Structures are given as C-alpha cells and as structure tokens.
Design a protein around this ligand. Sequence first.
Ligand SMILES: *[C@@H]1O[C@H](CO[C@@H]2O[C@@H](C)[C@@H](O)[C@@H](O)[C@@H]2O)[C@@H](O[C@@H]2O[C@H](CO)[C@@H](O[C@@H]3O[C@H](CO)[C@@H](O)[C@H](O)[C@@H]3O)[C@H](O)[C@H]2NC(C)=O)[C@H](O)[C@H]1NC(C)=O
Lengths: 52, 439
Amino acid sequence: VTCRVPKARNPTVTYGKNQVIMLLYPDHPTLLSYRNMGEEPNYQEEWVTHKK
Amino acid sequence: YEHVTVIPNTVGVPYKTLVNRPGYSPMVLEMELLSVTLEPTLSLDYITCEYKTVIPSPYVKCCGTAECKDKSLPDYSCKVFTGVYPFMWGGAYCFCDTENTQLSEAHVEKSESCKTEFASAYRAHTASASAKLRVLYQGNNVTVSAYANGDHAVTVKDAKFIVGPMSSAWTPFDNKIVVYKGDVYNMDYPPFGAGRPGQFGDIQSRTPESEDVYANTQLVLQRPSAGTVHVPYSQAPSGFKYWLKERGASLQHTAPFGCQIATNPVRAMNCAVGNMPISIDIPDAAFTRVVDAPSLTDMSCEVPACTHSSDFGGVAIIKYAASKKGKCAVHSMTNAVTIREAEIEVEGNSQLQISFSTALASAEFRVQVCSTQVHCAAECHPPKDHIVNYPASHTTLGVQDISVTAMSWVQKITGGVGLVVAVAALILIVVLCVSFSRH
Ligand SMILES: *[C@@H]1O[C@H](CO[C@@H]2O[C@@H](C)[C@@H](O)[C@@H](O)[C@@H]2O)[C@@H](O[C@@H]2O[C@H](CO)[C@@H](O[C@@H]3O[C@H](CO)[C@@H](O)[C@H](O)[C@@H]3O)[C@H](O)[C@H]2NC(C)=O)[C@H](O)[C@H]1NC(C)=O
C-alpha cells in the first residue's frame, strides 16, 4: 500500500561566496543530507530537531 | 551526409553542432539530453527477509523419558529436559512428580512476510545505456527515445541519429548490489550459505518461492521455568530487521556525479560522466544550396553588454546586408562562447540580436552566420549573484584564457625582465669575446 508522509517547510535561503545558507524550520525531526555532484560526493547527513 | 560530433554527458544542457557541407547552406542542430539511463545486468544470488521461529507444542512425557529425532529443517534443534513438573490452570499436568520429561523442538523458516518484505542480493555486470534526446532540427523540436549503445538509429524527420557508445564505463553500482524497495545499496553481502546471526544474510533463500532455506540464527533451546510448559530460547534477532534500521543512506543520496537511482528495473540516471558521441545521417534533400539560401555581407559585430554569468548574460548586435529574406544558421567559432540561438530570421539591411554565455573575462570570438564570419570583442563583467539553480551554459577556461589587460601586463613584465637578461647576456658575450680576442 502507499503511505502519506509530510513535506518539511521550505527553508529560508541566502547566498554567499561559494556558500548556501539555509535556515530550517522543522515541525518534527527531519533528515538533511547533501552531496557534491562530482567525483567525490562527500556525502553528509544529519537529523534536525529544531530551528538551525 | 554523415556528421560525427561529441557532446558532454550532461542533462538539461543543450549543445550545438555545425553541419558543414560545402556548397550548401550550413545547418546548426541543437541537441539536449533529457535523460540518460544505465541499466545493469543483474544476477540474483539470494534474497533475505525476516525469519519466523516455529515452535510446535512441546511434548510432555509423564512417568517416562522422551527422545528426539534429527531433522533436515533449516536450523533445527531438539532437547529433552528432565525433572519437569508443569502446571495447567486446573492443577498439575500429570501424575508423576519428578519422573517427567519435556521435549522441546524448534526450527527457523521464512515468514509469510517474505513475499512482500525482502531484500534481493544481486550480482551486477555491464549496463545497457539508453537516452532521451531533444533535437532541434530545421526549427522543429523532436524528442527521440533511443538506446545509447551505438547500435540504435532513430529517425528525426528523415535524419538518422545514432547515439553512443558512451566514453565512460563508470557506473555507481558495485559488483554486489542489494535492493530493498526503491533503495539500492552497494553492500558486500556474504556468499549464500555463509551468513551470520544478527547480520544481513542470517536467513537466505535463492528465490522468493524456494523452499530451500539457509539459516544461521544460533537458536538455542533453554530449560522452561518451573511449573510451566513454555519453550524458552535464545536466538539472534533477524539481521533483516537490524539491517532495515541500520541501512544508512542509499545510492540515490550517496552516488557520485549526481546519479539518480531507481528500481524496478534498477537504473542509474543522469550521471554527469564523460561524454557521448552522436552520429547523424542527413539526406541530401534536407540541404539547401548556397545560391538558394540567404547570404549576408557587410557584417559588423558590436557587443553592448557582457556578463560572464552561468546564464546567457551576454548580448551581441550584428549588422548585416541580406541578399534575400529567409532563415539563417548561427554558430560560435569558439568553444569558450555559447550562443543561445541556432537560427535567426534576416532580411534587407538591418541588425540581428543574439545572446551568449562565456566564462571569459574578455570575450573575443567569431560568429558564423550563413557562412559569413564576424569578429566580436567585449569586456565582460562578473555577476553579483553568487549562487544559481542551474548549470553553466558555457565551458570552463584554460590557463591561456585571460583578459586582454592581464595579457598586456604579463607582456610588459615578462618583456621587462627578458630585456634585462638580454642586455646582461649581451654584455657578458661582448666581454667574453674581448677576453677571447686577447691572448
Ligand atoms: C524547443 O524546445 C526548447 C526547450 O523547451 C522544450 O520544449 C517545450 C515545448 C517544453 O516542453 C519544455 O519543457 C522543453 O524543455 C524551447 O526553449 C524554451 O522555450 C520556453 C518557452 O516556450 C522557455 O520558457 C520561458 O522562459 C522564460 C524565462 O524563464 C519565462 O519568462 C517564460 O514564461 C517561459 O517559462 C524556455 O526557457 C526555453 N528553454 C530554453 C533552453 O531556451 C524552444 O523555444 C523550442 N523551440 C521550438 C521551435 O519549439
């Protein structure tokens, strides 16, 4: 069967030199993850439980 | 006419190739990859799922000793416990107090859930490539779905397009692949029959329907508590359940080159790796002779603005004198500068506008319109924006690709030092010549 899951609120995004700054507003613990799109993705992830 | 070109293996970025057949008006084709898929050949080694432990009602032999037989069941154990004095709700189970034995037995088998909840351990080999390509051919947008193994020609308005083989054999998938649902993992799973308790592969089966089950759960039967008939045991909890909690990120989130991962079938999509050759066969009927085509003369290029941003921030205005009204192909003569328009409509004595993108600090490039070339030059300025949501439409710069003033300063400094050396060298040579002249 198919389950319904929530979508976290859009982040507030500002930019710097080679930098993206996100302010996150989770209602409940939300997984954040990111990767480089090159040879070495340097994958990192963390759970966000509060505004960060 | 057979034309062979190569485009970078990127998605969402259009590339333009010039088809130059002398005596005929030039054609410019804009090709954009919309999707690139690599589908690995898979060979199932085994599957895993949660096991259930089956414990048949215990046999209590009153006033006598029970014995058990060996069984071939996947992970079977039997033990006879003496000195048992179990109670039922209405009182002691049987007549004898101490002369009683209980036979406990259990085996491990695949649960009913294994039909829905399971992971498949596959061996991955080579991958079949396929791609969806958008081609702008003679002003029309045609999307073709074709294989990218170099063995499939797909027709676009009577032109044949052969795609591939891809120049890179790289795949996000390792030799050992484990698939749960929509998630694919590069896990080095144990060989069938070599599983370990509490770990992935503790229970293994060759196929979902197979009755042949391997199990290593360390199922140990324990003595029942006094006065009871229950059958206690110590067993390593399913490694499948542990794995599900400890899965970590799937390849969809960890793969290099921004690869997207999907299952059913297993696919790696839109990997930004290497490049992809395209061979185009265009029939003579598709070519217009230069005598019938529009021809431009007295052309002059001026660039009122230039920004070296990822988008088409540059604009160039080119004056032209057209021999007749009609559409005309536009091509950039340098890799450093990407022109957005593939074709323009021209007539009479007027000017045309084209947009371009370059990483160059100083944009020096030539533009070919209806086989007539012009020279464009501009001083480009940097963008104020730091981040965008789209890839650059232009190529990267080489070490030689520097601004005009930077080159001038380099020549002045290099020449300055070179002059000092040349003078010092001349003085030394003259002095040595005098020294050699003298005896
Ligand atoms: C050939 O196709 C390209 C690319 O568009 C493709 O075909 C379209 C019919 C759609 O199916 C697209 O999803 C698909 O990718 C055409 O170029 C694109 O044209 C559209 C307008 O039709 C542009 O969208 C506009 O963008 C501006 C700026 O953001 C907005 O203000 C507008 O409101 C509108 O959204 C799009 O950006 C442009 N893309 C590129 C790379 O240029 C092309 O015109 C078409 N040619 C022909 C003859 O059909």
